[PDB]
Symmetry: D2
Subunit: 115 residues, 4 copies
């Protein structure tokens, strides 16, 4: 799988488990079309979102449903979600890991792009 | 201003200057409507986007045009932009500072909310 | 001041107030010697640690006492402190802002260096 | 192994490979004693630092040699290194992952503590 999402919780020092993640791809008319989705595992990871065949060059949006995550833990958060928007390019390496570190009023994200 | 945006460059260790910022607000029909825009100053700050009168309750999206920033510096970065989505003023009027720290393959953002 | 420290709390979305900060400077014998200390204000800022005259070339360590901060708020955090170590003024005198963003199991830090 | 270190590069969007990491444990006389060390792998990870038998409760310091890493890449960095200082507690879960995200003028670190 060429696309993986990993989510960490900076308050508890743990994987962020059971977080909903929605991936979109931008359509010709400039709208976001649903592409893949799931919930993070006990390791904070979401695998199997797509295949090499389906993950063509394009503009993608990964939406991590952070507000619902903080609410489930009884903590008041700021963001509705975290959105990571990027162009997938075949020149670049094959595997994209989108990592996100969550706090109630802050998030960080990085891309780890490897072969 | 009840809404301020501050952007730092983690590669240079400097304010991120001349970064375009676009703010949108969700309309009743759930579409994003333009609300305000501007560019960061030599201090990395963008003041004067709105007024207490105009900054009513709503769901807002602050997009920071990070790709345009990096490309102007000869870096082909990963993200298209950094996008901060939040409900504002739902518990009464507040002052919001959206701070962002940029690297070519990573960003963070935090909100500082005061009375 | 040529050296300023600013600290934010990523859980509350606020300045981190009353955070103790200790600055050390390496001596010729490679031991850390006390250089300056203070506490962050209601704005999360600590000004006036030193002067241009006293802030000579050297290797400095800014320790931010994050454990004491969190414990005062009922959180048992992971780190003892956040420690920022750098050479200063080696390319001529500069102004340094050390910014830190705190969560109970995570911190970040960035330097903004200006003329 | 109850202690693992993972290091990422926020400029290249890659694991930070061949980074020296030194771990210390605080001695009774309040000095730092060498405990374990290594260099990160091609995956940015350093495994096998210690065993459960040797990793007793105590205060530990993980020092990630970031300056040497940036110099090897021809980039001018700010920090001498990144230091992560923490108390290991047997009440807490068994496995400590120290993760660090590096930029030339900024670093972030989080602890992921799991069973
Ligand atoms: C296996 O542990 C990991 C930790 C991390 C940590 C990421 C992170 C991102 C932003 C930050 O501010 C701090 C850490 C990323 C990973 O990507 C495969 C794996």
């Amino acid at each position: 799988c060429p696309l993986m999402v990993k989510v960490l919780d900076a308050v508890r020092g743990s994987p962020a488990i059971n977080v909903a993640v929605h991936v979109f791809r931008k359509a010709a008319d400039d709208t976001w079309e649903p592409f893949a989705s799931g919930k993070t595992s006990e390791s904070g990871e979401l695998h199997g979102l797509t295949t090499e065949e389906e993950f063509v060059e394009g503009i993608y949006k990964v939406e991590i449903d952070t507000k619902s995550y903080w609410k489930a833990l009884g903590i008041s958060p700021f963001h509705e979600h975290a959105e990571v928007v990027f162009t997938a390019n075949d020149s670049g390496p094959r595997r994209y890991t989108i990592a996100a570190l969550l706090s109630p009023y802050s998030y960080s994200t990085t891309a780890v792009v490897t072969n």
